[PDB]
Amino acid sequence: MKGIILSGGSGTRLYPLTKVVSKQLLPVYDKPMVYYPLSVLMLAGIKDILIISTPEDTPRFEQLLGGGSELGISLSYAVQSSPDGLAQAFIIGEEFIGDDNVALVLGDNIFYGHGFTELLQRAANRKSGATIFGYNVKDPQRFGVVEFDEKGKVISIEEKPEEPKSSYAVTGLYFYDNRVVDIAKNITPSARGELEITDVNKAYLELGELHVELLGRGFAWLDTGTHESLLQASQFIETIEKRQSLKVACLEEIAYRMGYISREQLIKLAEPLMKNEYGQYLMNLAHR
Ligand SMILES: Cc1cn([C@H]2C[C@H](O)[C@@H](COP(=O)(O)OP(=O)(O)O[C@H]3O[C@H](CO)[C@@H](O)[C@H](O)[C@H]3O)O2)c(=O)[nH]c1=O
Numbered sequence: 001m002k003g004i005i006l007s008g009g010s011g012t013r014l015y016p017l018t019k020v021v022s023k024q025l026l027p028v029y030d031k032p033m034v035y036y037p038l039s040v041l042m043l044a045g046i047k048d049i050l051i052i053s054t055p056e057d058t059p060r061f062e063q064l065l066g067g068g069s070e071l072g073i074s075l076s077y078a079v080q081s082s083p084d085g086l087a088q089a090f091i092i093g094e095e096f097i098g099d100d101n102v103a104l105v106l107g108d109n110i111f112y113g114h115g116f117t118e119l120l121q122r123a124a125n126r127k128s129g130a131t132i133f134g135y136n137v138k139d140p141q142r143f144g145v146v147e148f149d150e151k152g153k154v155i156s157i158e159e160k161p162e163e164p165k166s167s168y169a170v171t172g173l174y175f176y177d178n179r180v181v182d183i184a185k186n187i188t189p190s191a192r193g194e195l196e197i198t199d200v201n202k203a204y205l206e207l208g209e210l211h212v213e214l215l216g217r218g219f220a221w222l223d224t225g226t227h228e229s230l231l232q233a234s235q236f237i238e239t240i241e242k243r244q245s246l247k248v249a250c251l252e253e254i255a256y257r258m259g260y261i262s263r264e265q266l267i268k269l270a271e272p273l274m275k276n277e278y279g280q281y282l283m284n285l286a287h288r
């Protein structure tokens, strides 16, 4: 499976933070925001990944992450000339996707919880249909909202409904089979002027092929869309990492743990970083 990170947009709410930095280049505690959705695609077993951003920001992501060889993966880049909708990812990424299935993750989403790696690899290995991930939230009108059965069967899906049909947000992580490219070409802009991922999911729902996994109250799903929520997410990660010997979304660690790179290769990455705690972390891991 291939994966795309949609890592553009204006980040208007975070102004002036986003006047000269992409929202997805801002810190979440100790690492750039984009590390977090990238880690999710890596843990799903996805090694061929396209990162989409604005004309100004795309080369900044490429500066940060490179072509992926350090992580035993392939990273490519594409520009989105205007933030015209999530569904544009599959239009921009058409040549990249080819005939393959593809996962999409939103650049400003932070997922964390027990059992997630297993859940990801399951979804990544499903060959047909769309898999979306629901989460019970306080203000469901702020999100795509999914309404489902006692058996977990989807009934409806709506983008930012004024009257939400349930409390379950549709989070920014989606797994699709190859139909999604032609689906995305056939949707049209909503009232917000955007080619909506919710309309991609509606197409699968019409076919009876939209499948929801509920993440559960024990899972953390945050986004960094406001100054307050960005700061809370940073605090959340700090609290986790302080207690444990372990980092969240440490890309080099994940590359090693997923078998994408060797112990020796991890040492080589750790060497030029031994001057900081991050390199020290990687080196301790290599020597375990
Ligand atoms: C519209 C647009 C967005 N983006 C990036 C910026 C963010 O990292 C990410 C999500 O865009 P936002 O405009 O923040 O999305 P938002 O309105 O919060 O809602 C989206 O994300 C929510 C989950 O975070 C879902 O519940 C909604 O269904 C989904 O439409 O995509 C792009 O890179 N290109 C775009 O065209």
Ligand SMILES: Cc1cn([C@H]2C[C@H](O)[C@@H](COP(=O)(O)OP(=O)(O)O[C@H]3O[C@H](CO)[C@@H](O)[C@H](O)[C@H]3O)O2)c(=O)[nH]c1=O
Binding pocket: 039, 043, 111, 112, 113, 114, 115, 116, 117, 118, 247, 248, 249, 250, 253, 254, 257
């Ligand atoms: C391995 C690894 C995980 N993660 C994140 C992904 C998840 O949000 C969170 C938990 O990841 P998991 O790999 O599912 O670990 P967790 O679910 O707490 O614990 C276990 O889940 C299963 C049941 O105990 C075990 O079979 C797994 O070996 C073990 O991982 O940590 C990272 O950010 N970095 C990592 O290197």
